[PDB]
Structure formats: structure tokens, C-alpha cells
């Protein structure tokens, strides 16, 4: 009902296929999820020195925040995703929707907090049960990267 939505994208693990339009992936996510909502956040975490520069430019043209971390710390991206989920939850109240685009079961408890103590609607976009259990909705990441337009 005009409730806020935040998208948090683990793009290291749910990546855009080589040669394909990241713009189209972002468009598909927004088309699937954003009707009736106000966008509070749409962010991905990555080490931009590892990522395809054209993909990153597409993301910035699509107004997806590209939060840079140094991936030589193996838990840096996961930590930043957790912190961003929590920051979203810190100043919004139910009703609100979190879309986590990740397959990292490491987020289980985060989602539990968001579901139980914050009362948020949780959509997990994953590649595939402990992680799935706390989500309200489970969507396969594949539908957002299948048969994409090519560069």
C-alpha cells in the first residue's frame, strides 16, 4: 500500500551472465516486485575491480547503488549486505518489503530478525532450507537472467 521496498543484491553470487544486459536484469526485478511500493534502496555489493566495467556502468545508469568493498576479505561483501539490510530496517517500519538476491544461507538469521522483530515481508531471490524457511516468498534467480538481451 505504498510501503517501502529495498533490494539487496549479492551480485558476486547472483551474477549477470557474460555478454548480457544488466539493465534488463534490473528492469525485470523492478517489474516483478515494485508495483505499489516506494523504492527505498536498490543496491549491490561487489569489488568493482573484479566486475565487468560495462555492467557497472549499466548499474549506475539504472540507479542501482554499487557499494564497493575489497573482496580480498572473503566476508566483506556478506558483512556489507548484512549491514545494509539492518540499516534499511533501522528507519523503516512495517509494512515494508525486503528483497534479498543471494543464495548465501549465511543470511538466515538476518531474515529471521527482519521477519519477526521488524515484521517485514521477505522475498528471497535465490539459486537453491534454513535460508528459505524465514522468507515469505521464494523466487528463483534464474527467471531474472534467462534469455537476456545481449550487448
Numbering used by the authors: 349 to 476, 480 to 502
The authors write:
Meiosis arrest female 1 (MARF1) is a cytoplasmic RNA binding protein that is essential for meiotic progression of mouse oocytes, in part by limiting retrotransposon expression. Human MARF1 contains a NYN-like domain, two RRMs and eight LOTUS domains. Thus, MARF1 post-transcriptionally represses gene expression by serving as both an endoribonuclease and as a platform that recruits the DCP1:DCP2 decapping complex to targeted mRNAs.
Although the NYN domain crystallized as a dimer in the asymmetric unit of the crystal, both the wild-type NYN domain and the mutated protein used for crystallization (I391M/L457M) are monomeric in solution, as determined by size exclusion chromatography. The MARF1 NYN domain consists of a central six-stranded parallel beta-sheet flanked by pairs of alpha-helices on both sides, in contrast to the previously determined structure of the NYN domain of Bacillus subtilis YacP/Rae1, whose central beta-sheet contains only five strand. Despite lack of extensive sequence conservation, the MARF1 NYN domain exhibits substantial structural similarity to canonical PIN domains of ribonucleases MCPIP1 (39) and SMG6 (40), superimposing with root-mean-square deviations of 3.0 Å (over 96 Cα atoms) and 3.4 Å (94 Cα atoms), respectively. Similar clusters of acidic amino acids define the active sites of PIN domain ribonucleases, including SMG6 and MCPIP1, in which they coordinate a divalent metal ion that in turn coordinates the substrate RNA and activates a water molecule for nucleophilic attack on the scissile phosphodiester group. Importantly, these amino acids are strictly conserved in MARF1 orthologs and map to equivalent residues in the SMG6 and MCPIP1 domain structures. Crucially these residues are not present in the SMG5 PIN domain, which has been shown to lack RNase activity. The nuclease activity of NYNMUT was strongly reduced as compared to NYNWT.
